[PDB]
Design a protein around this ligand. Structure first.
Ligand code: B12
Ligand code: B12
Ligand SMILES: C[C@H]1O[C@@H](n2cnc3c(N)ncnc32)[C@H](O)[C@@H]1O
Ligand SMILES: C[C@H]1O[C@@H](n2cnc3c(N)ncnc32)[C@H](O)[C@@H]1O
Ligand SMILES: N[C@@H](CCC(=O)O)C(=O)O
Ligand SMILES: N[C@@H](CCC(=O)O)C(=O)O
Lengths: 483, 137, 483, 137
């Protein structure tokens, strides 16, 4: 197929569907006519899109963990624990990494090994292998909405199965579930395959079935400048809306400076709404998700709580619709159900200690929001120019030319030229600009911010600072200070 | 010494890349020739690169937890490839979840790994062990 | 002695001293000549006053736990752990409650019983019984400054012993170590007895020895309105300065609304400096301490961390010089050294995650500060009016007439008329004013704020809401909402 | 419920007052005559109040941790006072620190307390126990 930012026709989509469902025998379990009626019978309390609307109406931040294991009963047991003992507002199912690479043969092997070992040897739930019948068992066993959380460049079959499975949200997008999660996949092909996932939600919404979509904001979770991360989310929201998506959660990964973070999340929500409306998408319901610190954690569990709850406080004060919970086991391995519920309990307690509180406007905040929107607009403007009005083509070309460039992405289609580093107050800034198309004024403000750190630490700003920042939180602080 | 060569990568269906960049930089700065095959690397890519570059050691990083599955068998393919005696290192977050480390270490040594590293291992440790093992301290 | 807000003469003070030192045989270990030379040999790193000056200069928040047990070696081992494994910046020694009531006989029994039992049966360190020799062994075993933390209406002997013992800060004051901590001590007597403690620091300062004093801000720890708490601390600062105190940490207990809390700490610091200067004390170095949530804690340890770390974030953004650390054992009992190091590590991580960050000014903040300063001025103004210019006499009369009224204080000299309650954003407000001398405009604003709560919860504001608020945090949230 | 009298206080050198206020409120609201002797109360004050008011029960609150010392002996003084069989309850945070609760309950029951309550006990629990014990549910 040729890539264009245009809604796929019904015939186009069906033709692709018949090919996708053949990629694993559980594809045979997907019946759209049957799935629509199943979906319509799920109570509103278990519909992710409808519960987001309620949370926005109530002014509350909802808490959602990450969770998944190889075997079906164990996976349900785990979700039930997070629900019941954790107090989760939303439930995930975290998909294993073989699934994410479309290796269902390896999924099956790992299911077998997990059965023998009595513990999960997969780092997540093999949804394709468990099929629609398994994903339905999961939904039926819990009392909260379910979302597929993962990181899959070609997610078409997974999406068909989890949504027919009654899972009413799908996370991801053609940039955010490519560049952080892949090496060899072109940006053209991941955008085409994510148009499928979005078009599938479009179909369901045309039938009156409401299903949330959530672009993955934090990307590599490693010093991503807010303006670069927001440009990706806004892009993914626009490309989703063109295929008919109506309920979108845009996301942002904590950088650590509270004002920068709140500015980023507000700019993200505002510019996303602004762009959708500017391009004629006038019926899209937009929510926000704040992810707690997605870089390296401290191994000490008490220090991990220091990270989890300061992150939550930022989320709370930002007015985030949703916050994704980290656990005291983050530095070490996939959390036990206990460690996970500790994360959720700590998180929800912080939220409840901050009920209705918001960060008030300040000059400091105003200034930072203006920086982030201008930066973001530089990028987006360039993308539209390169695509000659077509944002999907513009994205392909932006990656080809370093206009969009994600720090530390493994994708060979990512330039890897732009270098981020923190300033003296811990805000993430641009150290090296690469081909990111900023004006001199924007570039000079980043340099000015960064010189204040050089002066204070008595060393030139440098890649060594970057490495220090990569290690800082695991070593007990935000900023990679010398010694 | 005499520029020693290592193959460095991340095994299996694992896409984590930041540790790899740092390991590359640190071992390069310690004087090694780093042949970095990058992420999402199957066993056969470690072996091919070790053959072509006459590597002294293979450093297998595994962060995503399924390394327990992925790592099985490397030593035998290496021998079958004519790389008997090559040094095989494995580290990162090599099992799913928090586990008792001496049990984990044992399991991977049993797989034929010369050295096995726990979460949070500083590259300097691997660099010191490798210089010792290659008798170039 | 007659109570007047006037520095004691040297002769007056010496006469009192000869009386005080006879109250327990350890008083014979206090030699002021020898003690000044001992104190001057303490390195600056172990002097509480000096280190606070350093902290102010660096714009960092320092973390201090609470801690104390009956036996000397055990006590030392505990503090060393908190220093080494916890990372504390300042060390306490929390005095047991028998000492606080001057029952050294009971201390002694408790020391023997603890030896026999292999664990502390006292809820603190009996400094009078351990004497100067023991207090010095504590100091010599640590590498951080030491402060006596307690709640003692008649602290004169204690103060002579811990200061001669090398402890370079004493917490307390004539109001704050009476009303939350005693039932039958007149306000006149505790003001007089705290004049002694202040006067002793004054002596030491006249000799070139720097010693910190810290009025106890949180009082009963139970919904104390910022303006009532701040009036007490400002007063104790003024009364200490009159006796020659030169290094003063004023304190505030978290109420839980971040803007109210940061407004409260800034108003406290600013009005303390203003009042000191207006009354001619021009060489007083003032710092602030923020106490993490002093009300009932949740029993679950993960939720406890939610409270500990949210509280720290507020302290951090407030620019508190010091933060007092709570532990996950708070709801249950005196923390083990491990629970305590956990609280300190979580706290210090949060602080380090927020390095250099401050709440920027906003309209909301300026409005709250204006309310707080105004309320506080109303009270102080009346106090000076009642004392005909003498704030100490005015304090006694304020308590007699209920101008100053501390919620839930056990003191029978406390009116018990004023009643606090939270508003709809969790700010603590005045529900019943009793005899607190506010203008109608000030009362009206409190009423307005509370009505918003009534509207939202569907019930009139009431003492039932007060009870709900007293339990709310232990049941998982800041505001006692219906259910 | 049929009216009965209890003495309520906080023992020894303990000044905690908020729980006392709430316990008074809740027991009063449940139909008891609460004789509240308040904080910082020695044994003798509880006993005096019980006699003067012909109390059915004595509820000893201890929050500060030293109640393990302060609570020893009350049953004996009550017997000497002519209060044989009077109900004696103890609650709050009655020992220093987190301890294995079955150990603590036995310690205080061996001391002569009829009922021993752990941290965070709701008033309603003691109200139910007290009604049951006085055969007035
Ligand atoms: C950043 C992050 C990500 C980013 C990665 C972006 C990218 N492409 O690089 C994103 C958000 C995309 C992500 C994704 C996922 N992640 Co991740 N991630 C992390 C995180 C938070 C920090 C990793 C990091 O970069 N650290 C900084 C670098 C410098 O250090 P490092 O990677 O630890 O490497 C150092 C040391 O380990 C050591 N080292 C490593 N290898 C070797 C080898 C030798 C021989 C030696 C001497 C030393 C050594 O030296 C390195 C350099 O200093 C960790 C948790 C943590 N550490 O707090 C989880 C973590 C590694 N992620 C994890 C998982 C589960 C996932 C996913 C696989 C989820 C899933 N179910 O599919 C996916 C990836 C999909 C895939 N196909 O693999 C788990 C692994 C769980 C386990 N083993 O039990 C972790 C531990 C989190 C957790 N607790 O669950 N993640
Ligand atoms: C507020 C507070 C204070 C305030 C008290 C103000 C006042 N005068 O009331 C201040 C800050 C002044 C303070 C002081 C000190 N405190 Co204090 N305080 C608390 C705190 C934070 C909450 C207490 C509270 O009021 N809760 C709310 C009320 C409604 O609940 P409650 O008091 O628990 O009572 C309820 C239940 O226990 C139960 N209940 C209680 N008794 C009984 C009896 C029966 C028969 C029944 C059925 C039920 C029952 O029902 C009650 C009513 O709802 C607790 C910790 C916590 N719980 O989180 C520590 C706590 C009680 N304090 C403690 C201590 C150590 C002290 C001091 C003694 C310090 C010292 N070393 O000297 C001093 C007091 C000096 C003295 N002479 O006693 C410790 C006790 C430690 C232990 N037992 O191991 C605690 C547990 C904190 C801790 N974890 O270290 N404190
Ligand atoms: C990308 C982030 O997602 C979380 N994550 C990844 N896989 C799982 C799992 N199976 N269970 C829980 N959390 C997980 C980790 O906390 C990681 O860092
Ligand atoms: C007043 C606050 O001080 C703390 N506190 C009281 N006494 C001690 C002690 N000996 N050790 C540690 N913390 C203590 C409690 O956390 C309490 O609620
Ligand atoms: N996009 C996923 C990443 C976590 C994972 O890799 O499992 C999320 O936000 O949960
Ligand atoms: N004023 C004391 C109260 C704690 C105690 O009661 O020991 C402090 O701030 O530590």
């Amino acid at each position: 197929m040729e890539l264009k930012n245009k809604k796929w026709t019904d015939e186009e989509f069906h033709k692709q569907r018949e090919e996708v469902l053949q990629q694993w025998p559980t594809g045979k379990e997907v019946d759209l006519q049957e799935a629509v009626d199943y979906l319509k019978k799920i109570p509103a309390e278990k519909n992710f899109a409808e519960k987001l609307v309620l949370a926005k109406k109530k002014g509350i931040t909802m808490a959602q963990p990450r969770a998944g294991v190889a075997l079906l009963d164990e996976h349900i047991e785990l979700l039930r624990y997070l629900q019941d003992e954790g107090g989760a507002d939303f439930l995930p199912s975290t998909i294993d990494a073989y699934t994410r690479q479309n290796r269902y043969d390896e999924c099956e092997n790992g299911i077998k090994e997990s059965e023998k070992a009595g513990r999960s040897l997969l780092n997540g739930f093999p949804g394709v292998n468990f099929g629609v019948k398994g994903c339905r068992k999961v939904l039926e066993a819990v009392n909260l909405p379910l979302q597929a959380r993962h990181g899959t460049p070609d997610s078409r079959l997974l999406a068909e199965i989890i949504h027919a499975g009654g899972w009413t949200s799908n996370e991801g997008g053609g940039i955010s579930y490519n560049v952080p999660y892949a090496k060899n996949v072109t940006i053209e092909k991941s955008l085409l395959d994510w148009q499928y996932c979005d078009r599938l939600v479009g179909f369901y919404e045309e039938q009156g079935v409401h299903i949330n979509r959530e672009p993955f904001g934090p990307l590599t979770g490693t010093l991503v400048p807010p303006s670069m991360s927001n440009a990706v989310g806004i892009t993914e929201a626009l490309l989703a809306a063109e295929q008919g998506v109506k309920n979108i959660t845009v996301g942002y990964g904590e950088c650590g400076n509270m004002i920068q973070d709140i500015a980023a999340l507000r700019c993200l929500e505002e510019q996303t709404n602004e762009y959708l409306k500017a391009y004629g998408y006038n019926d899209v319901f937009v929510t926000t998700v704040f992810h707690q610190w997605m870089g390296g954690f401290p191994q000490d569990e008490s220090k991990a709580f220091g990270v989890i709850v300061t992150a939550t406080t930022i989320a709370a004060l930002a007015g985030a619709t949703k916050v994704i919970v980290k656990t005291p086991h983050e530095a070490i391995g996939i959390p036990t159900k206990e460690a996970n519920a500790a994360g959720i309990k700590a998180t929800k307690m912080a939220l409840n200690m901050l009920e209705g509180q918001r960060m008030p406007m300040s000059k400091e905040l105003e200034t930072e929001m203006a920086v982030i929107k201008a930066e973001t607009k530089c990028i987006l403007d360039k993308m539209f120019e390169l695509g000659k009005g077509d944002l999907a083509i513009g994205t392909v070309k932006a990656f080809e030319t370093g206009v969009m460039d994600i720090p530390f992405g493994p994708s060979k289609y990512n330039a890897g030229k732009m270098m981020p580093v923190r300033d003296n107050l811990g805000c993430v800034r641009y150290l090296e600009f690469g081909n990111v198309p900023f004006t001199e004024e924007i570039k000079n403000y980043n340099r000015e911010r960064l010189q204040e750190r050089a002066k204070f630490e008595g060393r030139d700003v440098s890649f060594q600072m970057v490495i220090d920042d990569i290690f800082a939180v695991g070593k007990g602080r935000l900023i990679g200070r010398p010694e | 010494m005499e520029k020693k060569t290592i193959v460095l990568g991340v095994i299996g269906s694992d896409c984590h890349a930041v540790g790899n960049k740092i390991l590359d930089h640190a071992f390069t700065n310690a004087g090694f020739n780093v042949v970095n095959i990058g992420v999402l690397s199957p066993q056969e890519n470690f072996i091919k690169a070790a053959i072509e570059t006459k590597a002294d050691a293979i450093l297998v990083s595994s962060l995503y937890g399924q390394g327990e599955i992925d790592c099985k068998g490397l030593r035998q393919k290496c021998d079958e490839a004519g790389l008997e005696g090559i040094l095989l290192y494995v580290g990162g977050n090599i099992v799913v979840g928090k586990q008792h480390w001496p049990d984990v270490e044992k399991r991977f040594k049993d797989m034929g790994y010369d050295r096995v590293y726990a979460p949070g291992t500083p590259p300097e440790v691997g660099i010191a062990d490798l210089k010792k093992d290659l008798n170039i301290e």
